[PDB]
Design an enzyme around this catalytic site. Structure first.
Site, PDB file in Angstrom:
ATOM      1  N   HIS A  35       7.261  -8.364   4.812  1.00 16.10           N
ATOM      2  CA  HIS A  35       7.448  -6.958   4.575  1.00 16.10           C
ATOM      3  C   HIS A  35       8.273  -6.261   4.542  1.00 16.10           C
ATOM      4  CE1 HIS A  35       4.057  -3.299   4.574  1.00 16.10           C
ATOM      5  NE2 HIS A  35       2.702  -4.938   5.434  1.00 16.10           N
ATOM      6  N   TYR A  90       5.536  -4.428  15.516  1.00 17.58           N
ATOM      7  CA  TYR A  90       6.831  -3.768  14.493  1.00 17.58           C
ATOM      8  C   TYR A  90       7.043  -2.022  14.637  1.00 17.58           C
ATOM      9  CZ  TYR A  90       8.975  -8.342  15.453  1.00 17.58           C
ATOM     10  OH  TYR A  90       8.902  -9.822  16.107  1.00 17.58           O
ATOM     11  N   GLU A 138       2.912  -7.302  -3.855  1.00 17.43           N
ATOM     12  CA  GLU A 138       2.249  -6.802  -4.309  1.00 17.43           C
ATOM     13  C   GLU A 138       2.747  -4.710  -3.900  1.00 17.43           C
ATOM     14  OE1 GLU A 138       1.292  -6.966   0.154  1.00 17.43           O
ATOM     15  OE2 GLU A 138       1.964  -5.297   0.626  1.00 17.43           O
ATOM     16  N   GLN A 143      -4.257   5.567   0.560  1.00 17.41           N
ATOM     17  CA  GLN A 143      -3.344   6.377   0.833  1.00 17.41           C
ATOM     18  C   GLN A 143      -3.103   7.885   0.182  1.00 17.41           C
ATOM     19  OE1 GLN A 143      -2.330   3.383   0.268  1.00 17.41           O
ATOM     20  NE2 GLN A 143      -1.436   2.614   2.559  1.00 17.41           N
ATOM     21  N   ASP A 164       4.570 -12.521   6.225  1.00 15.57           N
ATOM     22  CA  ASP A 164       5.146 -11.705   5.584  1.00 15.57           C
ATOM     23  C   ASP A 164       6.036 -10.981   6.617  1.00 15.57           C
ATOM     24  OD1 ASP A 164       5.082  -9.669   3.845  1.00 15.57           O
ATOM     25  OD2 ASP A 164       2.676  -9.194   4.015  1.00 15.57           O
ATOM     26  N   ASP A 207      -7.880  -2.309   3.141  1.00 19.41           N
ATOM     27  CA  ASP A 207      -8.198  -1.129   1.778  1.00 19.41           C
ATOM     28  C   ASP A 207      -8.637  -2.004   0.283  1.00 19.41           C
ATOM     29  OD1 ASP A 207      -4.768  -0.444   1.728  1.00 19.41           O
ATOM     30  OD2 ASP A 207      -5.539  -2.147   2.110  1.00 19.41           O
ATOM     31  N   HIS A 233      -2.598 -10.113  -3.329  1.00 20.99           N
ATOM     32  CA  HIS A 233      -3.276  -9.198  -2.821  1.00 20.99           C
ATOM     33  C   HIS A 233      -4.434  -8.865  -2.487  1.00 20.99           C
ATOM     34  CE1 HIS A 233      -3.276  -5.303  -0.219  1.00 20.99           C
ATOM     35  NE2 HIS A 233      -2.386  -6.274   0.660  1.00 20.99           N
TER      36      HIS A 233
HETATM   37  O1  LIG Z   1       0.012  -8.241   2.995  1.00 21.78           O
HETATM   38  C1  LIG Z   1      -0.679  -8.145   3.587  1.00 21.78           C
HETATM   39  O2  LIG Z   1      -1.715  -7.553   3.876  1.00 21.78           O
HETATM   40  C2  LIG Z   1       0.151  -6.450   3.717  1.00 21.78           C
HETATM   41  O3  LIG Z   1       1.345  -6.648   3.178  1.00 21.78           O
HETATM   42  C3  LIG Z   1      -0.570  -4.873   3.650  1.00 21.78           C
HETATM   43  O4  LIG Z   1      -0.335  -4.682   1.994  1.00 21.78           O
HETATM   44  C4  LIG Z   1       0.198  -3.743   3.957  1.00 21.78           C
HETATM   45  O5  LIG Z   1       0.256  -3.900   5.675  1.00 21.78           O
HETATM   46  C5  LIG Z   1      -0.429  -2.519   3.888  1.00 21.78           C
HETATM   47  O6  LIG Z   1      -1.500  -2.281   4.264  1.00 21.78           O
HETATM   48 MG   LIG Z   2       2.012  -7.761   2.289  1.00 27.39          MG
END
Ligand SMILES: O=C(O)[C@@H](O)[C@H](O)[C@H](O)CO
Ligand SMILES: [Mg+2]
Ligand SMILES: O=C(O)[C@@H](O)[C@H](O)[C@H](O)CO
Ligand SMILES: [Mg+2]
Lengths: 399, 397
Positions: B205, B155, B255, B40, B203, B309, B305
């Site tokens: 999140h 979402y 993460e 990012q 997740d 990316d 994680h």
């Molecule tokens: O565990 C995962 O792969 C996700 O939480 C990603 O780290 C998050 O959507 C950011 O790209």
């Molecule tokens: Mg995650």
């Protein structure tokens, strides 16, 4: 009040004295301009990249009035979050938005918060020298000016390894000896009390130079000299060791200039492990989080001594004075006199009067930046050799 | 001595993501590659490497990774955080790459070698319908996967469908209750259809407030997830004590961590079951070894994680860490697309649900600098990170 639309964002780095200072400027359609401090002195180009390439695009066009929303949004905008580069960039914006709000309100910044809870904030300044007589000289100057609190340091700690019991071929770095440092510091305190009694409160910054076992020994020995506070007696990742100090020493402790993550201070404060919180306001993300942290400290009986050394703009200094006259638990404001160049880049920067800093009383923060004038003192690369701090065996220690 | 002669930082975007690679050159002809990917904010990481780390690295002995790591970590005085740590990670990994190359060994062999034959992998199945999930799941099962992170629903986006206010503030909207209900329905449906045929991960999140998280943990427990990930944001993990006292749910978190203070109490108090840190965000291989060992002491397993990316160099590093560290559990799948494989040759893909560590000297994956140049950095806003609840409030994304 109507919506206040952000029209442009600038980030200016300038070095009028010895430190790279960083200012964020927020312009609005309404012609009301805000100024904020984003100073992470050691990595200014990284902060400027952060503002220019990443914060600007997400802020242009937004309503500046909703500072709280914009702060919450900015803080999580990169997903990953909480650090010195991101938070400083956000601080510059947050402070500028508060500046804009105060200007729209026609009020000094601290009046938005709920106004004063003291008339002015006391100040402490810095007396550091290699000789006791150098310290005495500085101290006596400060006393003449009405200072009643002075941070004193005897000796300078970081040079060639040759002076120390080092190895055959020491790795390049800034060497010091922890025992020598402690011994000199205790001697300094003893000498100061014999010479001046209680004429002024003495502060001292351990600057994370010690291992935990040394820190507790030092706390016990220094207690008798009744320092106003001993600062950063441990690094931010070993503050759990404060418990053993608190159980057997009455020494007053300040800590936190290094913090940029709430998890660094939450347990610390809730468990009363310090007496003065020392955060650098731009490191935690600006005014918005500083109010909340101030209130958190108030709940737990911790007082406030925000970090205010020269590596910060006078805009940031003014902001801290506004915070300091407002928050009931603010204790003291660190200060070093500004040089001629700095006074010129940031007009109307307040200096202490008889040991007190008074908040600005015009609308807004009260201090801006002269852009065309800041350009005379461009950003300077600095190696900061002192951050490569090493013990005699050659190992890095937290600097 | 292996003297560092130059440092490069390359941003490349072969797919959706700005990937960041650090190259460490030496006078011994040996070249190191590492991952510094903070997708990012890539230009900030590159500024950090180019302007600030390079000058403190040129001419230094690359052999002493530990010294260089300790030195870099405090070099700016202020420390931690995603920008500095990722920059340092790129260097750290590249120094490890160099050391492994000089040893003529795969990276994991430097560490002490394997403590498992390969690391299991979990994949991702997200769909707007249960049928969509079933189709994805079945494709994964056919390929030999035994662990799948499942999500029902998307979402974010426009709040028109939600119970929002008259004039919602611009943002990516969702409803926490709809999300929790859908997720529970998903678990129930998957168990009814597949029973224990495979492990189901999910997740959260950081979508929830603590009181919602506690309730969700207790409800989802019956469906026996392999783990529930990021049930809380990194500043509310004290609330894990509430969950741990009344639910047996397995939890993964971390993460988002970039500061040791975020994980220390968490781990020492056994508040999670799987550490999830992103290796580059904690500063590279050097601190990952120590954190892995810390977790081992406390009975916590490792699920670093992994995502598209992160460079395939970063992925390869995680597989080396995963076959070495005894308490490693599982590696999150990253299906890399063709362009990315072109820019980072020889990237491993799972075989029958397992990732095998590279066996050539070094990390095993490098960047092809010419190939990388075909895909220059491109600005992305990442609009999803402006996540809002129906009343218009930001929530941690
Ligand atoms: O565990 C995962 O792969 C996700 O939480 C990603 O780290 C998050 O959507 C950011 O790209
Ligand atoms: Mg995650
Ligand atoms: O409290 C202080 O002024 C010192 O800790 C300095 O901020 C530090 O040396 C970095 O400039
Ligand atoms: Mg200090």
């Amino acid at each position: 009040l109507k919506e206040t639309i952000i029209s442009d964002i600038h980030c200016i780095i300038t070095k009028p004295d010895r430190h790279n200072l960083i200012t964020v400027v927020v312009e609005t359609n309404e012609g009301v301009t805000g100024f904020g401090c984003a100073t992470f002195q050691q990595r200014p180009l990284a902060v400027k990249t952060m503002v220019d390439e990443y914060l600007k695009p997400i802020l242009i066009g937004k309503n500046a009035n909703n500072i709280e929303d914009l702060w919450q949004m900015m803080m999580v905008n990169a997903y990953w979050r909480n650090g010195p580069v991101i938070n400083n960039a956000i601080s510059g914006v947050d402070m500028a938005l508060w500046d804009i709000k105060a200007k729209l309100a026609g009020m000094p910044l601290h009046q938005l918060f709920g106004g004063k809870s003291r008339d002015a904030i006391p100040v402490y300044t810095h007396a550091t020298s290699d000789t006791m007589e150098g310290i005495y000289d500085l101290v006596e100057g400060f006393l003449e000016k009405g200072y009643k609190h002075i941070r004193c340091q005897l000796g300078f700690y970081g040079g060639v390894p040759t002076d120390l019991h080092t190895t055959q071929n020491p790795t390049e770095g800034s060497y010091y000896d922890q025992d020598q440092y402690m011994d000199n510091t205790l001697t300094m305190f003893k000498s100061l009390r014999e010479k001046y009694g209680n004429q002024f409160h003495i502060l001292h910054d351990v600057h994370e130079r010690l291992f935990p076992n040394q820190a507790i020994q030092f706390a016990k020995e220094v207690e008798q000299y009744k320092p106003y506070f001993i600062e950063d007696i441990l690094p931010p990742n070993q503050t759990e060791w404060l418990d053993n100090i608190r159980s057997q020493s009455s020494v007053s402790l300040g800590l936190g200039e290094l913090f940029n993550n709430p998890e660094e201070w939450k347990s610390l404060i809730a468990n009363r492990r310090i007496d003065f919180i020392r955060c650098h306001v731009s490191q935690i993300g600006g005014i918005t989080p500083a109010l909340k942290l101030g209130h958190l400290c108030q709940n737990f009986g911790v007082r406030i001594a925000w970090h205010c050394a020269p590596d910060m703009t006078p805009i940031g200094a003014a902001v801290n004075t506004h915070l300091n006259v407002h928050l009931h638990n603010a204790a003291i404001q660190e200060h070093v006199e500004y040089n001629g160049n700095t006074h010129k880049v940031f007009p109307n920067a307040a200096e202490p009067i008889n040991g007190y800093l008074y908040a600005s009383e015009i609308a807004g923060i009260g201090v801006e930046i002269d852009r065309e004038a800041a350009a005379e003192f461009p950003v300077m690369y600095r190696p900061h050799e002192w951050t490569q701090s090493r013990l005699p065996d050659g190992a890095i220690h937290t600097p």
